[PDB]
Design a protein around this ligand. Structure first.
Ligand code: GTP
Ligand code: GTP
Ligand code: GDP
Ligand code: MG
Ligand code: MG
Lengths: 420, 429, 69, 50, 429
């Protein structure tokens, strides 16, 4: 049981959710038709399994496109929360004028899906920080669900403004506005960025003609591997809360980087062996992360690992022992045995093993600082402001968002080196 | 007459109990059907002439629970002895002892209530709680509390699995373990400790299998426990008493944390080539490499030792092995206990499981000892606890669940009181 | 211009860190073996090794019983 | 820029590692140095005379 | 009662021991199965009524080791008595005695530790180390050192194979041999030397086979050793004592390097045509062409001689052969030993191996003698050592492995001290 509800947001979040449901259907043996050929699905007369997946957005072209592609019959025709105007890359648009009139349609449907279960252990949001809709609308949904349900655990698979270029000109504004309302009411922010995702699909995988469905498939395989330890048996099982405890020692430093494995070349997929020491090499390799922040330029406040496949436990023991042994000061030493380990008992579709590494570390603080830097630049010199200020927002909130980001990062950095 | 109850609370204890019962049936001759083609201590009567165990598998996370209820061993357990929660304790002590413990405690108490009503001659309890997780820490602590406030007079032998010396399957292990030690003191009348490193070394370089796994580990623990309970199950030459165990291995109610050992652990490939004499096995008996836990034999001065002989054992080889071990200087005892040896002979050889690495041999011995070395495990747990408590880590996970902050420290110096006494009792005069 | 100079300096910093880790772990493991061997030394050196065979109580038994005989 | 901290750390750890190498040498020398029952049979010797 | 331990260290000793045990089983009636369809000295008890030898095959290079562990004789040896290294000693003494020796020495000491604990009545050791290679030189030296510093009281008979007089399978033989001689003095209480030229001549023009090979050589050495150990294995007429061997063949602890000989070595093709009388065999006994080592019988003045008679031997032919050899001038003894003859009769004929060139005959005799001729082998080794040491050759191979340079010279004049004493003891008065 121990339910999940899959609310989406923005065209990004919509595509990622579509492909994630594709992956979970293809894993649980669910067709695009919705049969078997409940921890994620719901029973429906006629022998159907409907995903309790809500797609909300301020534009329907995304809605139409996600309906059009394969696996579209999964989502039932009520959870398509239709927006007609579009926030148009404006946090004020996506959070105040259209938020405060979409909140409650979403409230009725989320109460729908929440009473549909018995025990809703955790939520599920995938959205953006830069798009007006995604950012504002999504952090507003987060605030609302965290207002009524204080006992659940919040979780966002969040895409941030890209380093080399900003996807939309107001990426800094929307991103700081999203994090300022993310810190207190979002319990686990898995930080992803389109550029690092590009890097991981490019470097070791031969992919020369990539596509957004491809990156969605990658991050959705990761998104399935993070929790696949829940719905399946295992010698040493976990959940969202053992993970949350072993990951956050403080309610603030709870933003996590994620990676999934294995991922190698296909033409070279035969020449290499395939073992668990090789899995450790694969992801404790710096380049295998899904965030534009090499974690070995910082420190690991703690890190959790979740296995998939049936091998021994001698493995995971020597695993985190060996890795702590050499990359010790790459972690933080003020906390004992900062690596947590669990095992899911089932391997992936067609392959032998899977591994998911999640990390509560202090290298995303530079991501936060680069966001705040771009923000402050466009902010003092007043770049792209009337779009936010002529729609019932003031820059007092912008100042406080920027300063709050800076406060978060100041704790991140001092907790990097705090020792006793 | 003698009946013994076993709780398998947590995810560690529940798998240890799965292996315990999977070995108990094959030893007593019970097939997994509940059908059998003495057993007084473990197996009850159902009015149709077949057996249902007197044990309860309790755990917050229901995964291993449906594993056992739809596996192959469904026909043994009673549906009344398998209760599941829909959540966990998040590896913190407060969620398993304060929040989610209270609605499972009364159900478990009613089940064991009626189960102690069911059997006539209860003699002892066995709590199986790997303290590393929130359930095996807090819910097991609360279970032991209630067991001791209801029953009290009856002995309790806890096979608690501490957070391992440096390896760990969780980071917040140091908190939810020191807090369980408090209840572990009073309630667990005698506590046979477990850790992971030593059984890993044993399974790797003793049975020559190159990946040791948890199923093998739990099978091996079940074999040790079979050597433990054979004396009451089957008839022996000089039968020992489990209440004699307490009166001989608890010199003071302050020193009752005890460790164990087993011989022989050998593959068939070296069993065919070894002699394995009665005197020879008594050497690997106190071998420090054979040690089952993270304790050093020369760290502790032995205060009490019980030897469990099973198979074709003649008493005089036992008596001469005692002489040779007491002669050679490599072992020593506490001065106040001039004779701290108690032996028990049993004419039942160890039974064999199909599909096990373990080898059938004539003679088996199991050591269980109250010494003063365990204080090192105590201080080593205190290491991680202080290293985490000095910096505020995971404190919110504990206080946001009905727990005050001072319990961390009170449990820390509680286990420090054990460390103090364990070195104050074992000195010269 | 200076950004690539910083890049090269940070490649040097990465090498330097990596090194410091190698040597720190060597130091740890060496010390652990050294402590192991030193404790082996302190327990192997007996507290009655100077008198490799003395047993003075039975030497007294020896002398008194010799006088007796 | 900020490298001299890790350089002096390397010098410290290298002096300490070679210093524990000296330690190890000392301990192996002392092991080689230390490298350089009859009571009951004497009771048996007493039995005959008594 | 009498048990004897054999180390086969190196690549020479390990093959000599392969042949030793392959002959021992066929002699005692043991099949290679470990099954047998007395043996007290060599064969132990496994509790299933079958035998595992009391010997260890040790070698840095693991090639012959996996040869024996996946050959046809796997069922005999215990997996505890076969330890392998992953490297060699590069034929230099320092890599086998200083660098790679130290991590194998304690394992071998623990194995023989427990093995001497296993057998009850140990009586002697037999070290089998062809010193030509780095292992058989340095690791064998260190093994003998540890054997003598732990055991001490017990006799050690070394069948060391020196670098051959002028032939050589290695060039750096002169270094790593003189250095082993140092430890060979104190530790190897009695050292029966071996070289290659004489057994080559024997196998070529004595058994008439035209290519002698190492398997035949090791089989022949095993036959000699069978004639040696028959006295303790099987019952004889006048049984001899292996501690009498020392007290009669070691006139001074400075002269204990001894040589050997065997008769008859004859093919069946001349055994059918020869009479081979008891008196006749005693002539080829001291025949200088029959000599087993590079020693000249008229070079040394015999100080002690032990004769090993086996088969259908009546004592008076023995006594009259002693008379005739002491009468004729071609032999002579030292003046200080007026009678330096010790004989041992045995009623067990030599057993036959299928597939051997060796012929079955009624009477066999084995000579083992402490004389003063061995000093020529000593000086001949010193030849090559000085010729290499005078020019700096391979010195780096030794000093780059924890070795100082002066040990070369200290070992050179160490063996020179033997050469000196061996001529100072055997003069007139
Ligand atoms: N010996 C042994 N130990 C086990 C076994 N299974 C789990 N463990 C140990 O149990 C520890 C965790 O204890 P648990 O209380 O069972 O963890 P949990 O059930 O997830 O508890 P929660 O965190 O509240 O969900 C791990 O660190 C393991 O070392 C087993 O089968 N045999
Ligand atoms: N009699 C006899 N001698 C042998 C036999 N095998 C090897 N030898 C001798 O052993 C000598 C070399 O000694 P070893 O110590 O075994 O050489 P090694 O094993 O290669 O030693 P490393 O150089 O350290 O690798 C050779 O010169 C041979 O004369 C054998 O089967 N019988
Ligand atoms: N991973 C992923 N990211 C996307 C995809 N489509 C858009 N994005 C990212 O999402 C951001 C757009 O945010 P969004 O809220 O959807 O825009 P809005 O709907 O106009 O407010 C851009 O910065 C893109 O980089 C996709 O298919 N996959
Ligand atoms: Mg649990
Ligand atoms: Mg070699």
């Amino acid at each position: 049981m121990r339910e999940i509800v899959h609310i989406q947001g923005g065209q990004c979040g919509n595509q990622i959710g579509a492909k994630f449901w594709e992956v979970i259907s293809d894993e649980h043996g669910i067709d695009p038709t919705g049969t078997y050929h409940n921890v994620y699905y719901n029973e429906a007369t006629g022998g159907r399994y409907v995903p309790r997946a809500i797609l909300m957005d301020l534009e329907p072209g995304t809605m139409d496109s996600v309906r059009a592609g394969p696996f579209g019959q999964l989502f039932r025709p009520d959870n398509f929360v239709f927006g007609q105007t579009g926030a148009g890359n404006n946090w004020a648009k996506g959070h105040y004028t259209e938020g405060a009139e979409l909140i409650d349609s979403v409230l009725d449907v989320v109460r729908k899906e929440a009473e549909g279960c018995d025990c809703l252990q955790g939520f599920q949001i995938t959205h953006s920080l830069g798009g007006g809709t995604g950012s504002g609308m999504g952090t507003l949904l987060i605030s609302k669900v965290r207002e009524e349900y204080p006992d659940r655990i919040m979780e966002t698979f969040s895409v941030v403004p890209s380093p080399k270029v900003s996807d939309t000109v107001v990426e800094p504004y929307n991103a700081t506005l999203s994090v300022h309302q993310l810190v207190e009411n979002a319990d686990e922010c898995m930080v992803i960025d389109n550029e690092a995702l590009y890097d991981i699909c490019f470097r070791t995988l031969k992919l020369t003609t990539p596509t957004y469905g491809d990156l969605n498939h990658l991050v959705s395989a990761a998104m399935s591997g993070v929790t696949c330890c829940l719905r399946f048996p295992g010698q040493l099982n976990s959940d969202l809360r053992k993970l949350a405890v072993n990951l956050i020692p403080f309610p603030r430093l709870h933003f996590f980087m994620i990676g999934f494995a294995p991922l190698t070349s296909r033409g070279s997929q035969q020449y290499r062996a395939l073992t668990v020491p090789e899995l450790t090499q694969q992801m404790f390799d710096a380049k295998n992360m899904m965030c534009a922040a090499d974690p070995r330029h910082g420190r690991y406040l703690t890190a959790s690992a979740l296995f998939r496949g049936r091998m021994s436990t001698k493995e995971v023991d020597e695993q985190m022992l060996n890795v702590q042994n050499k990359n010790s000061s790459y972690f933080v030493e003020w906390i004992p045995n900062n690596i947590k380990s669990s095992i899911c008992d089932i391997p992936p579709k067609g392959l032998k093993m899977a591994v998911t590494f999640v990390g509560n570390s202090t290298a995303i603080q530079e991501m936060f600082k680069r966001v705040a830097e771009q923000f402050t630049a466009m902010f003092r010199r007043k770049a792209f402001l009337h779009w936010y200020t002529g729609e019932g927002m003031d820059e007092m909130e912008f100042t406080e968002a920027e300063s709050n980001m800076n406060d978060l990062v100041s704790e991140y950095q001092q907790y990097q080196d705090a020792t006793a | 007459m003698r009946e013994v109850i076993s709780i398998h609370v947590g995810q560690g204890g529940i798998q240890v109990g799965n292996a315990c019962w999977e070995l108990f049936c094959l030893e007593h001759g019970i097939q997994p059907d509940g059908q059998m083609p003495a057993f007084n201590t473990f197996f009850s009567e159902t009015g149709a002439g077949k057996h249902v165990p007197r044990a309860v598998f309790l755990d917050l996370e229901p995964t291993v629970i449906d594993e056992v209820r739809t596996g192959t061993y469904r026909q043994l357990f009673h549906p009344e002895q398998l209760i599941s929660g829909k959540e966990d304790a998040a590896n913190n002590f407060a969620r398993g002892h304060y929040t989610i413990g209270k609605e499972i405690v009364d159900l478990c108490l009613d089940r064991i209530r009626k189960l102690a009503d069911n059997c006539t001659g209860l003699q002892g309890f066995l709590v199986f709680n790997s303290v590393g997780g929130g359930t095996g820490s807090g819910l097991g602590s609360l279970l032991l509390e209630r067991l001791s406030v209801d029953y009290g007079k009856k002995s309790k032998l806890g096979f608690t699995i501490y957070p391992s010396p440096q390896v760990s399957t969780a980071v917040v292990e140091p908190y939810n373990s020191i807090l369980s030690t408090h209840s572990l003191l009073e309630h667990t009348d005698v506590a046979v400790m477990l850790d992971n490193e030593a059984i890993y070394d044993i399974c790797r370089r003793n049975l020559d299998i190159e990946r040791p796994t948890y199923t093998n580990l739990n099978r091996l623990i079940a074999q040790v426990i079979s050597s433990l309970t054979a004396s009451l199950r089957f008839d022996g030459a000089l039968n020992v008493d489990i209440t004699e165990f307490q009166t001989n291995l608890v010199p003071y109610p302050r020193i009752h944390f005890m460790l164990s050992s087993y011989a022989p652990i050998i593959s068939a490939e070296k069993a065919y080539h070894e002699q394995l004499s009665v005197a020879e096995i008594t050497n690997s008996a106190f071998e420090p490499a054979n040690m089952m836990a993270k304790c050093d034999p020369r760290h502790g001065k032995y205060m009490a030792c019980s030897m469990m002989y099973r198979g074709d054992v003649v008493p005089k080889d036992v008596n001469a092995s005692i002489a040779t071990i007491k002669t050679k200087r490599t072992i020593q005892f506490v001065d106040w206990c001039p004779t701290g040896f108690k032996v028990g002979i049993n004419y039942q050889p160890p039974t064999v499981v199909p599909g096990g690495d373990l080898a059938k041999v004539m003679r088996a011995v199991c050591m269980i000892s109250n010494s003063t070395a365990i204080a090192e495990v105590f201080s080593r747990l205190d290491h991680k606890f202080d290293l985490m408590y000095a910096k505020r880590a995971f404190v919110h996970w504990y206080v946001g669940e009905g727990m005050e902050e001072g319990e961390f420290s009170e449990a820390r110096e509680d286990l420090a009181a054990l460390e103090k006494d364990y070195e104050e009792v074992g000195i010269e005069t | 211009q200076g950004s690539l100079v910083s890049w090269s300096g940070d490649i040097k910093d990465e090498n330097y860190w990596r090194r410091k880790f190698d040597e720190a772990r060597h130091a740890t493991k060496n010390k652990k073996s050294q402590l192991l061997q030193l404790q082996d030394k302190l327990n192997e050196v007996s507290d009655a090794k100077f008198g490799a065979v003395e047993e003075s109580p039975l030497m007294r038994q020896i002398r008194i019983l010799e006088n007796r005989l | 820029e900020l490298k001299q901290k890790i350089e002096v750390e390397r010098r410290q750890q290298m002096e300490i590692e070679k210093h524990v190498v000296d330690f190890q040498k000392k301990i192996i020398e002392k092991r080689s140095n230390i490298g350089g029952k009859q009571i009951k049979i004497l009771e048996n010797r007493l039995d005959k005379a008594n």
